Write a protein that binds this ligand. Structure first.
Ligand SMILES: [Ca+2]
Length: 357
């Protein structure tokens, strides 16, 4: 009931991120289509958490640059949240922030620029929500999906927030929708939960759903991408939309996103609390950076592997739903993979152990 907040370190601790690793030698690319960040907030924040501040650099795509508007409730909130969560948890990694115009081509160009970047050479790319998959021009979906396929072939991991408006994803057309890029089978789709945790244990973790007013995690069944071969044993249900039909299930994993149990951050000089699935992609980008550091080689495309690992690697979320439109409870969490939280929240050290040869 009482709203709370965690520093990113608290959340990493709850998910048992592997100790002694900080992402040294890795580079995490973060895609942004607006706003900016200021060095003052970043320095104050990293100093406050006691971590050595990671190097953060901006990359201009199609003429766009780092331009904070100064409004803590504007786009700077998302930009600084992304950098602060990733940087606080993989402080040994270099962070490259790619700014592009807010257009389909700018978004595509930022991704490809990051993936093929010979100067920054990122091994991981973190992206926020981009909109209901069926609101996208088909040619844009194809181009974006190919960019993700290329990243997978190149050994670059791509993570994307699943959305903040539940199973309907902000549309009021009487249908359920999943968000893109999360829906691409080549992206690690990140859903959201409400986490109640302390240093040594998770007291409770449920689906993030604060109703129409407070938001809810995206999740569902794609109407564009077929059910991947590697996801056929996850028990993805048919789409809830009349006509049903199988399709790629969203999300793949999930982590704390509820603003009511949000992240303490500093935006435009102001200490405040922010949530949303935009926090989850960078959170897990940091985990992957630590794992890549230990393995000595990037894990790249992880989806097929994740779905074949033993379930002990994940914390299964079984309670809650992401319906903020009606009383049907579509979709609902339950034992095993579900369309609200996927495989659940990863247990960092067990995931690393499972990936060690
Ligand atoms: Ca579950």
């Amino acid at each position: 009931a009482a709203p709370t907040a965690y520093t990113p370190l608290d959340v990493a601790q709850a998910y048992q991120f592997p100790e002694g690793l900080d992402g040294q030698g890795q580079c995490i690319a973060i895609i942004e289509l607006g706003g900016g960040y200021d060095e003052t907030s970043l320095a104050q924040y990293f100093a406050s958490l006691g971590v050595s501040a990671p190097q953060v650099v901006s990359v201009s795509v199609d003429g766009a640059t780092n331009q904070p508007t100064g409004d803590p409730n504007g786009p700077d909130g998302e930009v600084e949240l992304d950098i602060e969560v990733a940087g606080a948890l993989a402080p040994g990694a270099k962070i490259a922030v790619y700014f592009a115009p807010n257009t389909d081509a700018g978004f595509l160009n930022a991704i490809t620029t990051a993936v093929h970047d010979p100067t920054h050479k990122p091994s991981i790319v973190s992206i926020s929500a981009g909109g209901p998959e069926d609101s996208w021009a088909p040619a844009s979906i194809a181009a974006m999906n190919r960019a993700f396929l290329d990243a997978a072939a190149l050994g670059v991991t791509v993570l994307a927030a699943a959305g903040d408006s539940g199973s309907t994803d902000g549309e009021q057309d009487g249908l359920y929708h999943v968000d893109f890029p999360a829906a691409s089978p080549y992206v690690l789709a990140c859903g959201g939960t409400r986490l109640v945790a302390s240093a040594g244990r998770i007291e409770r973790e449920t689906v993030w759903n604060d109703g129409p007013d407070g938001g809810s995690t995206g999740g569902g069944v794609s109407r564009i991408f077929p059910l991947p071969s590697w996801q056929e044993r996850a028990n993805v249900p048919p789409s809830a939309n009349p006509g049903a039909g199988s399709g790629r299930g969203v999300p793949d994993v999930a982590g704390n996103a509820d603003p009511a149990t949000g992240y303490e951050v500093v935006i435009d000089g102001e200490t405040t609390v922010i949530g949303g699935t935009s926090a989850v992609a960078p959170l897990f980008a940091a985990l992957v950076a630590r794992i890549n550091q230990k393995l000595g080689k990037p894990v790249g495309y992880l989806n097929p592997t994740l779905y074949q690992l033993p379930p002990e690697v994940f914390h299964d979320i079984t309670e809650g739903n992401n319906d903020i439109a009606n009383r049907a409870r579509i979709y609902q969490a339950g034992p095993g993979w579900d369309p609200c939280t996927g495989l659940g929240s990863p247990i960092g050290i067990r995931l690393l152990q499972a990936l060690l040869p």
